[PDB]
């Protein structure tokens, strides 16, 4: 009766994994090598003696035990003294690897087949063959680059050392101070002045600090509780600290000051419990730890460390250059591009294969088109031929652009299609040497992205897919009886001035005004109107021609430039040549705009070189490490390996180890992705060779993640379908093993290398409830003053999920929090720490004493869960004068998240998404899809943070009819100020999202995904209409209140 008796015959459940990624292990095919294992050992003699040895045994241990059992086998005398030998075997990355560091254990070799071989150290420069260190840190062998043919790569490897060498010299200028600047760069906010609401916590600007010291017996500590100005530098804070040590009835005032002076400069300030250090002229409260201490209601706990015992630690980096160690040719060996007389033509020939059904598809064809990102002529499809069965052409597509028009950054784009696209690729029309590509090429194609229905895809990676087993696509480029080159800058400037002077004397009439010293005063405002528009506000061709005409005026409003550059026609050689010359001596602009000019709308070397120069002057190392994610993504958009932006970043990473750290991880995280693999490997190689000892600290982190990647893999594949209790037995059994005890203890948190990770308190380490078996890990903080910061560092390692969406919303959240804070509005967000370190693998900072709203409700469990349970639970932590604050905090944090989640449009907020700290702060975790990816099934968007009854109570204290309180009116006013504050900085967010189109996130595949953020801030409307949009949409979602 239920299913009108209809049988489903197809259906069966024997193996359907919708019910209840995917880096091979310690040996090939097996994750965890058995505790005894059998290793064939090959010697200089041809005997293969098969030793059993322990999983965890060193190469020393197996060596001296293969020394003794080689006595028992034949032909002993010719086997030299063992000290004259080394091991070697083939690894899973399929490379012969000499094993020098014989402290290394059998499990930690990544061995493929359980065998060793003895040979002698060939190449006595053994110090040099620790590139292994680098190749391990990078996650691919360095020798894999040496065998690369393409001279762009070989040139990159050799040319980029310029930046290495320079940066290392800059470290050792004022050494050993400047080496501690490199290593321990001061962590300071961007604005030296405080906002008002922070000032008011200090009484006319005085913090109570505590300096600490240690002296014989050396196990004693000593408080010195000062009360100094927030804006006094560390020197003075070291002074006042020494004043108190000495101050005595036996020192006069004069003797004291002499005893100060001498004792000042011999000490520096360190944060207790972590390796931050206050190393320069910065107001105490400009340092982040202080401004952090103020806000939380905490008393700074610094330390007096002797500069001797700091400069004790910092090792000599001593970079060394690797084995890869105006024309003298009379002018014009080559022909300048501008001489050539023809249209562009390109020969399509054959596509080795395409995987298609002969039945279902009618016919197929190679589509082509020349590009600058967006297009400079009609797309030239080729005719249909041998459709779906042995398809080759042999045609010459004729593109309507004359060769001298081709802009520097011009690219062929192509695909193969059906009567929908089959496979695509793009090619730079100019090689890295300025030389216009000629001859035949072999363009292996890329599979189309998932949601991408567009035929051609010119935002994809330029270059051939390095998997040869793909749709190859042979093609020929016209040859002009000579090697052609892009015209020298000299030649372009000449031609600019000619077109400039040729402008001046044209006809009285020109199709009206058309695309061309009339200084109209209504027009002079229409520029500034358009200047301030948001990047995604598409411009009308009238407005382009308008902008393009008063180009020479636009230089007085430097900020208009992004809008100007778009309007320029790049398929006009003339227009471009003048633009180049404006940009040559255009004046610099704010790094937030300069960033725009490194997105995919702006491929041109001249435009992009400018942007690097804005950053080179005006971007601080704070604002760099803030926007480091977007800059790493933007490397992809560069045409060639060696370029201005990579040199810039590589320098800054080699200046500053806290940049360097995340710059290494960010590259490393995307190292699995074969489209960036080479570009980033080569960059990672250059960084590892220059960064100094940190490479050894990175190796500990890298070696750590591997163990944890390997553990969770076993947990997720075999120990699935076994009770938590057995998995937890397995977890701890594995962690106690000595290779794990080595590998997971005594290294730096990659979430923050400031924090050290000591010994693994296994009592607290556990496998979380989630399906992806996240590991809750917990470490002793080995700092000497750990007591004053945290005794225990606990962070979560998660093998299942793609963190990088979270990573980005957490970034954007911070940037909101900082925009608000500085503008006066105090809305405390908690953008906890998250770091993608691989293909859906990463780290997440825990927040102690915080629980999901759901958990709270199970503590207040007794039928029906009361909405007051939250309010009661919060009162039970916070009592007295305290209580009023805990509400304020909750109210402030709730408003912040209300606005931010609305704008970004993040995943719907239920009770297991939202968390509350004991101190009363509310924050969101697990954001999922940001710009509403959940409307591909299914106008006016959604409010994803819907304020239940529960929350409203707490905002309005214990209350009935809680939407009518003044507590709620004040809460509402925060949301209005906040929503407007963000809107006034909307460009930044529009750009920041646009810069991330280069990462392969399904939620950011094109500019029309970033549409949403325009509508939600409502930029096309006015601000009063957007206010009322927000109020409208907030009223709609709660069924009244707003």
């Amino acid at each position: 009766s239920y299913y009108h008796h209809h049988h489903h015959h197809d259906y069966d459940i024997p193996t359907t994994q919708g019910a209840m990624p995917r880096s091979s292990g310690e040996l090939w095919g097996i994750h965890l090598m058995p505790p005894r294992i059998l290793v064939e050992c090959l010697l200089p003699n041809g005997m293969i003696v098969t030793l059993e040895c322990l999983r965890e045994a060193t190469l020393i241990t197996i060596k001296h035990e293969l020394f003794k059992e080689a006595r028992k086998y034949p032909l002993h005398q010719l086997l030299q003294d063992e000290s004259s030998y080394i091991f070697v075997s083939v690894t899973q990355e399929a490379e012969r690897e000499e094993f020098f560091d014989e402290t290394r254990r059998l499990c930690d070799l990544r061995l493929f087949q359980p065998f060793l071989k003895v040979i002698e150290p060939v190449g006595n420069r053994e110090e040099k063959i620790l590139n292994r260190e680098i190749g391990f840190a990078i996650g691919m062998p360095v020798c894999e680059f040496d065998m690369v043919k393409d001279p762009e790569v070989q040139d990159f490897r050799r040319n980029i050392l310029n930046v290495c060498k320079e940066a290392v010299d800059l470290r050792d200028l004022n050494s050993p101070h400047s080496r501690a600047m490199y290593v321990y760069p001061p962590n300071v906010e961007s604005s030296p002045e405080l906002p008002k609401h922070i000032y008011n916590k200090l009484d006319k600007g005085q913090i109570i600090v505590v300096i600490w010291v240690i002296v014989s017996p050396n196990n004693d500590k000593q408080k010195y509780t000062l009360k100094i100005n927030h804006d006094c530098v560390p020197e003075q804070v070291i002074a006042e600290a020494i004043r108190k040590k000495t101050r005595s009835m036996l020192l006069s005032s004069e003797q004291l000051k002499l005893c100060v002076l001498e004792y000042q400069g011999k000490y520096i300030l360190k944060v207790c419990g972590c390796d931050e250090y206050f190393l320069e002229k910065y107001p105490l409260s400009q340092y982040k730890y202080i401004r952090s201490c103020i806000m939380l209601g905490r008393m700074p706990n610094l330390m007096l460390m002797a500069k001797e015992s700091l400069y004790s630690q910092l090792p000599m980096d001593c970079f060394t250059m690797p084995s890869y160690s105006p024309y003298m040719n009379g002018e014009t060996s080559t022909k300048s591009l501008w001489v050539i007389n023809s249209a562009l033509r390109i020969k399509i020939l054959c596509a080795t294969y395409v995987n298609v059904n002969i039945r279902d598809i009618d016919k197929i064809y190679v589509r082509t088109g020349i590009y600058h990102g967006g297009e400079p002529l009609c797309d030239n499809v080729n005719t249909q031929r041998v459709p779906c069965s042995n398809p080759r052409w042999n045609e010459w597509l004729n593109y309507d652009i004359y060769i001298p028009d081709l802009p520097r950054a011009a690219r062929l784009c192509l695909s193969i299609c059906s009567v929908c696209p089959l496979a695509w690729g793009n090619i730079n029309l100019f090689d890295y040497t300025d030389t216009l590509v000629s001859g035949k090429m072999a363009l292996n194609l890329w599979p189309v992205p998932h949601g991408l229905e567009d035929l051609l895809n010119p935002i994809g990676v330029t270059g051939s897919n390095p998997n040869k087993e793909t749709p190859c696509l042979e093609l020929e480029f016209d040859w002009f009886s000579s090697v052609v080159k892009f015209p020298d800058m000299s030649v372009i400037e000449e031609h600019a001035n000619w077109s400039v002077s040729r402008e001046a004397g044209f006809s009285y009439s020109h199709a009206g005004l058309s695309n061309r010293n009339e200084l109209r005063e209504n027009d002079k405002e229409q520029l500034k109107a358009i200047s301030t528009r948001d990047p995604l506000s598409e411009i009308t061709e009238q407005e382009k021609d308008f902008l393009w005409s008063h180009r020479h005026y636009c230089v007085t409003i430097p900020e208009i430039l992004p809008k100007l550059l778009l309007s320029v026609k790049w398929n006009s050689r003339d227009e471009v040549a003048q633009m180049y010359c404006l940009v040559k001596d255009w004046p610099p602009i704010k790094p937030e705009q300069a960033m725009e000019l490194l997105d995919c709308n702006y491929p041109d070397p001249m435009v992009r070189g400018f942007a690097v120069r804005c950053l080179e002057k005006y971007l601080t190392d704070d604002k760099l490490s803030q926007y480091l994610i977007q800059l790493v993504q933007v490397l992809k958009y560069e045409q060639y390996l060696d370029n201005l932006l990579v040199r810039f970043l590589l320098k800054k990473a080699l200046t500053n180890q806290r940049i360097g750290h995340f710059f290494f991880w960010h590259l490393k995280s995307e190292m699995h992705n074969k489209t960036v693999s080479q570009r980033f490997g080569l960059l990672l190689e250059s960084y590892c060779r220059a960064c100094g000892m940190y490479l050894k600290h990175l190796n500990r982190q890298v070696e750590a993640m591997e163990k944890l990647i390997n553990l969770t893999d076993i947990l997720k594949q075999e120990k699935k379908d076994e009770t938590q209790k057995v998995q937890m037995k397995f977890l701890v059994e594995q962690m106690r093993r000595p290779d794990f005890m080595d590998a997971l203890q005594g290294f730096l948190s990659p979430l923050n290398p400031a924090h050290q990770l000591g010994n693994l308190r296994l009592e607290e380490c556990r496998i979380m409830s989630s399906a992806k078996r996240p590991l809750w890990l917990n470490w002793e903080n080995p700092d000497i003053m750990s007591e004053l910061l945290f005794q225990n560092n606990e962070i979560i390692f998660k093998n299942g999920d793609d963190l990088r969406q979270d990573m980005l919303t957490l970034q954007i959240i911070r940037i909101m929090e900082n925009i608000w804070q500085n503008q006066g509005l105090d809305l405390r967000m908690l953008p906890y720490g998250c770091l993608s370190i691989g293909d859906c693998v990463g780290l997440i900072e825990v927040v102690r004493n915080s629980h999901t709203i759901m958990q709270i409700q199970c503590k207040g469990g007794l039928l029906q869960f009361n909405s007051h349970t939250l309010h009661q639970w919060l009162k039970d932590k916070n009592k007295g004068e305290i209580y009023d604050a805990a509400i304020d905090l909750f109210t402030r944090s709730c408003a912040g998240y209300c606005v931010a989640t609305f704008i970004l449009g993040i995943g719907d907020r239920h009770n297991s998404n939202i968390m509350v700290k004991d101190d009363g702060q509310l924050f969101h975790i697990d954001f999922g899809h940001f710009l509403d990816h959940k409307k591909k099934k299914f106008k006016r968007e959604r409010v994803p943070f819907v304020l239940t009854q529960d929350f409203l109570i707490v905002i309005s204290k214990g209350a009935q009819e809680c939407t009518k309180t003044r507590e709620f009116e004040r809460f509402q006013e925060m949301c209005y100020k906040a929503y407007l504050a963000i809107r006034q900085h909307a460009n930044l967010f529009i750009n920041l999202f646009s810069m991330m189109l280069g990462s392969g996130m399904p939620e950011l595949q094109s500019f029309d995904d970033i549409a949403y953020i325009r509508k939600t801030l409502a930029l096309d409307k006015t601000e009063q209409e957007a206010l009322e949009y927000f109020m409208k949409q907030m009223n709609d979602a709660h069924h009244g209140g707003w």
Binding site: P44, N45, G46, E375, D379, L422, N467, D1008
Partner: protein, 216 residues
């Protein structure tokens, strides 16, 4: 002239190689907006329309610039039946993309595995030779010097070495033919996605018929 329709106008213009008319972003900015010369924005301001608005649209594009709405009654629940067809077909497309991807990693894992085998092999060939240097430098004696206390065991090493060598080349072989079924399996997965794609697009378009004209 409603008897003529920015984000959603970009979306409907997607999958077109065409024109349509749209309202403005501000009333005070301009009146309306017109959107084959590469698709770009033509402001209807160009004191309203010089030809009463529609007479200018029928009229047309090089004539000024250098660089120059079906009702769908053609063929309630007709959304519910076609959208669940679209989504159950979409479910299938993304079903294969997972299999497409995982297989591609798997394949690349196998060829790297083979490169490992080949090198491992070569170290064992190179070994069986290494003895014939040092073993038949000491086959000098052959029959005496305590008879065959040395010369019987030397063979056993040689005998194992070669039979191990065989087991390696057997395992590689097995891998190579494992990679082939996969390579074939991969090509076939790509094949069905390509047959689905356009049907999946038409269902999204034929949904888009009754999309504009609870369940979903």
């Amino acid at each position: 002239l409603q008897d003529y329709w920015r984000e959603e106008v970009n979306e409907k213009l997607r999958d077109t190689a065409t024109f349509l008319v749209r309202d403005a972003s501000t009333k005070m900015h301009g009146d309306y907006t017109l959107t084959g010369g590469n698709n770009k924005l033509i402001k209807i301001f160009h004191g309203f329309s010089d030809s009463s608005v529609v007479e200018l649209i029928n009229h047309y594009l090089a004539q000024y610039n250098p660089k120059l709405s079906k009702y769908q009654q053609d063929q309630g629940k007709k959304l519910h039946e076609y959208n669940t067809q679209f989504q159950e077909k979409s479910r299938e497309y993304d079903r294969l993309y997972e299999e497409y991807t995982r297989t591609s990693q798997e394949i690349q894992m196998k060829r790297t595995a083979i490169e490992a085998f080949n090198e491992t092999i070569k170290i064992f060939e190179e070994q069986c030779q290494t003895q014939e240097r040092y073993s038949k430098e000491y086959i000098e004696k052959f029959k005496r010097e305590g008879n065959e206390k040395e010369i019987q065991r030397i063979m056993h090493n040689y005998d194992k070495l070669k039979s191990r060598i065989s087991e390696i080349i057997d395992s590689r072989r097995r891998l190579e033919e494992d990679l082939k079924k996969q390579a074939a399996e991969y090509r076939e997965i790509d094949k069905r996605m390509n047959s689905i794609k356009p049907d999946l697009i038409q269902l999204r378009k034929t949904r888009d018929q009754y999309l504009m004209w609870e369940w979903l």
